[PDB]
Curated annotation (Swiss-Prot):
Both isoform 1 and isoform 2 are phosphorylated by the RIPK1/RIPK3 complex under necrotic conditions. This phosphorylation increases PGAM5 phosphatase activity. Proteolytically cleaved by PARL in response to loss of mitochondrial membrane potential. This is Serine/threonine-protein phosphatase PGAM5, mitochondrial. It comes from Homo sapiens. Dimer. Forms a ternary complex with NFE2L2 and KEAP1. Interacts with BCL2L1 and MAP3K5. Upon TNF-induced necrosis, forms in complex with RIPK1, RIPK3 and MLKL; the formation of this complex leads to PGAM5 phosphorylation. Isoform 2, but not isoform 1, interacts with DNM1L; this interaction leads to DNM1L dephosphorylation and activation and eventually to mitochondria fragmentation. The lineage of its organism: Eukaryota, Metazoa, Chordata, Craniata, Vertebrata. The chain crosses the membrane at residues 6-28. The N-terminal 35 amino acids, including the potential transmembrane alpha-helix, function as a non-cleaved mitochondrial targeting sequence that targets the protein to the cytosolic side of the outer mitochondrial membrane. The gene is PGAM5.
């Protein structure tokens, strides 16, 4: 049941949750508490 959970997970990380951090790092250095 965790076989499909691995393929559906990368789907959102292929251009969604990586954007929020992408710009956050492009504007400055991320830190534990602010990012």
């Amino acid at each position: 049941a965790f076989r499909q959970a691995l393929q559906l997970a990368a789907c959102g990380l292929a251009g969604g949750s990586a954007a929020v951090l992408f710009s956050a790092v492009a504007v400055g250095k991320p830190r534990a508490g602010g990012d």
